[PDB]
Amino acid sequence: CSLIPDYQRPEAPVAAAYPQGQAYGQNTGAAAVPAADIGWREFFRDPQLQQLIGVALENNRDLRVAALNVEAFRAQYRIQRADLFPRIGVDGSGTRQRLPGDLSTTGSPAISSQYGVTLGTTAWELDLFGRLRSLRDQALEQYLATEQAQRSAQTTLVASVATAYLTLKADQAQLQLTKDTLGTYQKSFDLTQRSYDVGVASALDLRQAQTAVEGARATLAQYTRLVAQDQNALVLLLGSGIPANLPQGLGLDQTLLTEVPAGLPSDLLQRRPDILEAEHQLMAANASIGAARAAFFPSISLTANAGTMSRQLSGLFDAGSGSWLFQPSINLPIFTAGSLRASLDYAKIQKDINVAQYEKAIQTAFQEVADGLAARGTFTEQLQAQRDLVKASDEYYQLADKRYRTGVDNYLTLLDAQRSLFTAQQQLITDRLNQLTSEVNLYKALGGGWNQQTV
Amino acid sequence: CSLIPDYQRPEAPVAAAYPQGQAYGQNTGAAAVPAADIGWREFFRDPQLQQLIGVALENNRDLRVAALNVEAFRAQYRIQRADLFPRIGVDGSGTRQRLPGDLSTTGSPAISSQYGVTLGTTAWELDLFGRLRSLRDQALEQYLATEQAQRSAQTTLVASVATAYLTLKADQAQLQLTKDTLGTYQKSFDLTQRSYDVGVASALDLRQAQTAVEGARATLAQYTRLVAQDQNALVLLLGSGIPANLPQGLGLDQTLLTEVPAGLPSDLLQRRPDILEAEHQLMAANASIGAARAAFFPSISLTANAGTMSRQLSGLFDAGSGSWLFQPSINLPIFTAGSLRASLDYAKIQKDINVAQYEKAIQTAFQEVADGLAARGTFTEQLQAQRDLVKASDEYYQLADKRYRTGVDNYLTLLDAQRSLFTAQQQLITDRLNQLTSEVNLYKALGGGWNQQTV
Amino acid sequence: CSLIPDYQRPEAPVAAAYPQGQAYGQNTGAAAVPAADIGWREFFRDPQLQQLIGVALENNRDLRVAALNVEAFRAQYRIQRADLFPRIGVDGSGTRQRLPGDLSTTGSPAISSQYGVTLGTTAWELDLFGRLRSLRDQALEQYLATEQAQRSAQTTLVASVATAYLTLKADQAQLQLTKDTLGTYQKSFDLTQRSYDVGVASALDLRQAQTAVEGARATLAQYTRLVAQDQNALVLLLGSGIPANLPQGLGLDQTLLTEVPAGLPSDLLQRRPDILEAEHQLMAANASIGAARAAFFPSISLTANAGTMSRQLSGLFDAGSGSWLFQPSINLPIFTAGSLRASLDYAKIQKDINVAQYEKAIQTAFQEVADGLAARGTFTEQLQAQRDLVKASDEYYQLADKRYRTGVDNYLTLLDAQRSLFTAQQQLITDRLNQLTSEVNLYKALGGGWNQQTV
């Protein structure tokens, strides 16, 4: 008979819907195609990024640690299930003891020798009241939790390598713009050096033009540092090196990522891997309270073995020398000092700390999906205002170019308009990077990318 | 007899007082009332913040994990001291053993059937040389360590909810100031648009106005994202949601928190939770070294049982047959080839490990008090300076408004004055936030967020 | 007869050499002297750092926790080694079994009595199959992992105290520069106050100069608290206080850190501490696989002791009551419930988990040293441009001073020049602190400071 108590899923401390406000959008209350049913291959529309996901799925090491830990706790489940069945094993035995004058059968102090080679089982208990079955349920549900933690490790891997490639892709263009700013500053210094060599400009404007080009060289070396360190932070996450068969990836000024419907706060509890990892931890916990409840009842321990036993070693086997042994045994405690009740209360509040950690996990998941929704609501006008800034500075630069080309104003104010346009382009790229980074983090927060394609 | 070592605390590696230089004002010497017994109701003078902390102490989840691990180690202590008392309980033994005729005293190979229920104890050990009571002392003192760890979890949770609420308030004030700057740039852009339509301002000034207003719209969208970010962080630190029954909270410029005395560096040794849990873990190691010392000495064991063992299938409770077994056992390990000596060495250097972790914890506590005392010593001479900057820019705007309403300068210079005044007020509130979060961290470092009221 | 499989270390997932491009430097061949054998007293060329880092290694406490954990696992190795040898001891006894009348040999209920002390071993198992030797190898190789985990802790402590001392010097230098800018701003303010009383300047330029002065006072205070905060970080990281007999340390203008040959990625597999730590964890699991495989085979347990037995305690010291006992009780399993194969492939995939840990640790080490190589190849051409900026601004200030002394521009343009020069010097101090912390992290990533001088 079993003794595991029943289970109801606890009411999460999440509210009814996602939070509303000036930052957020409007909720679509449908769950037709959720996020975890959308694979990463349809979500990411950059093919070299897709093969970087495909090579980081196979040549990583943290995902390998997780995918080996799931079969490690599968083996732990196999040994905790194997404790249920008996231990049929051949065990030899013998004795050569002297007995004194009072313990011997003869009366004179002499020795006696008895040897035994049998087959059977020692120190095994019959599971009649559900204890090792409860340990088996605890190990099974630890195995299920470890599988879901492997899924969580793959989601937090694919989000990290996606945002690492997005940071590297943005910083390539950052270096490309910083080289053009260095070119504009260098040509401004060349014009001020020509104006100093003839006599129009003094040395003060020459120094003030020189300090700007050394500032441009300093920040150029800074962005080369940051590009190289982000290449190293990417080649850590891939495990293997960057491949040489890269297809032509898309530009950063396009739609790299598709939109995902957020859904309801009750859509997390069925498909988010970390919170139902915590739910299977709670499953192991109430299997453990089912184990601790079975410590009160008696445990039928049966130690049976059948073989041969003889005094003489000259005869290995004989028809008479064959023997068996049965030995039934029951044991229930009567009056302890409370160690059974202390273990029962210990397992009960292990279940209680695991339900506390479960609802803490759903609170953290709801917090990260909530500020992911806030970023989805705000970047769609932040980046649009930044594009209007870019169009305004681009019209300013082309208007300054078409008033330079006639001949009204000199080339130095044209370089000033050009470096202002380049600063605006750098701000546009470092804001599009934050939009794509938080969208990848929202995709990880909803249900993550586990499967390859949709279902 | 018990043989745990006679204990004295290690001396605290600190200075005799807090450091004094240009940054630190002056230490206060002996505190009359210490920093620990100032509850969070007579310390946080904001009533809305007091209700927020009152929700966070009853709805957040890490506090529940710690405040149920305290009963987990209650149950661990109870089972560890219940191991000492005898485990009396009925058991029914038995042999159904075929026994060969050469082993038989009768002569023919026959069986023997002796089985019967019997009440008593199996392998009960007495700690008369003091190992089990030392393990009891170890379990009790690491239970007290987990008690102090629960107090540390509470006094970190109060500080975290306070810092989240203060960052949320400062971000709402920054949202209001940047919304005012966006309003002033729209009030500049429509004037520049009319000056472009009538023909005075060229299109370059119009593109500069578009540059300014789209930069301010991007900054407004960034801050209205970040308000929702830290609001969801406050939702996580509460556990529950924000209640709708709140009073009117205090502002930033008003006195939000009260004064707390620092004291000696010898108050952290008594009234700080992590130092006390390191101390009680050192206590538990000082009991484990006593267990390893008592492992040398003899450990006697008494096992006895009373019942019936009549040799019949149908005869169990028959008058005139009562089993009365009473077997003691002594033991003394003479030669162990360096196992028990290695166990005593291991327990002694575990005690040394806990001494090292105790002094590491007290130095981390000393440093996180000392940097907060440095911030309280010199942030006044920054806040007064930034307040004088805000006052100087305010009277600068008042003189620019006098020049405008007289009629000397146009409206755009008044908008530049409002730009400078809004930048000054934004710098003032982002410094007041740093002050308040640093002295909240100072109050957490002195260890006073535990109790509800004062003493 | 041991069953541990013979090992060869896994091939490195790193590439053939360090990566090269435009940011990286062109690497040399192999190392004449390796990076871990570079003189630790010869690497840091400051007097003060070299005298303070001995106090750092002698009085910091995570290093002491590691250097006591190495003795802890030495004692655990001695326990696991002494478990192989027998454990002989006085196995005392004594039985008083009031047996019923049907089981006693006389036919009447009587008292059965045995007594006596007995010297010898009990339940000791012969380790001729490689089980306890494999557990001894597991303990020995975890000891050898922790012995260089202590070296890794010493490495990161040396790197952390070097970065803390360098950021202390950099914050004191930029504190001095901020104090000089506060002096120049105060001179600008009282010149504008002198030019305000007689009526040359209105009450707008005076307010602008006043806002500049209070901005300087706020900046001076927020650098004073930063100096007092990282000095407290350094006095945490030393453990003891800063000593008073400090020799004069040479500043950031001269050289501080010698050149270190990086070498090859094959050189990193023999001298970096945590790589060999993961290799010894791998070998510990590769001994645990032999420990799991050695349970298929028949274990050879033995029980042997020799004592004197009698009916009463008066017949203990009796010539003719001596006896012995000799029980070779072997055992061998023939039917398990898959537990043996589960333990076998469980230890096999634990070996594969530690393989994945090892070739993840090499990837993290290669990422750290590749970041160091990028910084070493780029900070030279960053700071050459930055010192050209400082030289250009300095001779700009010299031209402005030789413009001022003849009396054609004000003192306020001289203060503009001093503003430019001091901002240039402050940016130079920050970039050189970046170079020094990146090169200290390179020295931590290659081989660390463990050898006290050049080996």
Residue numbers in the entry:
A (entry chain C), B (entry chain B), C (entry chain A): 1 to 455
What does the paper say about this structure?
MexAB–OprM, the only constitutively expressed pump in P. aeruginosa, is thought to contribute significantly to drug resistance in this species. Here, we report a structure of the wild-type multidrug efflux pump MexAB–OprM from P. aeruginosa at near-atomic resolution, in the presence or absence of drug. The overall structure of MexAB–OprM is a vertically elongated rod shape, ~320 Å along the long axis and ~110 Å along the short axis, and the stoichiometry of OprM, MexA, and MexB is 1:2:1.
During this analysis, we identified two modes of binding of OprM to MexA; accordingly, we determined the structures of both states of MexAB–OprM pumps at resolutions of 3.64 Å (state A) and 3.76 Å (state B). State A and state B are quite similar (Cα RMSD: 0.47); however, the relative positions of OprM in each state are related by a 60° rotation. In the 60° state, on the other hand, H3–H4 of OprM face the α-hairpin tips of the SC protomers, and H7–H8 face the α-hairpin tips of the LC protomers. Several hydrogen bonds are present between main chains: Q104 in MexA binds to A203 or Y411 in OprM, and K108 in MexA binds to G199 or G407 in OprM. Also, L100 in MexA engages in hydrophobic interactions with V198 and V200 on H3–H4 or V408 on H7–H8. These results suggest that the two modes of binding between MexA and OprM do not differ significantly.
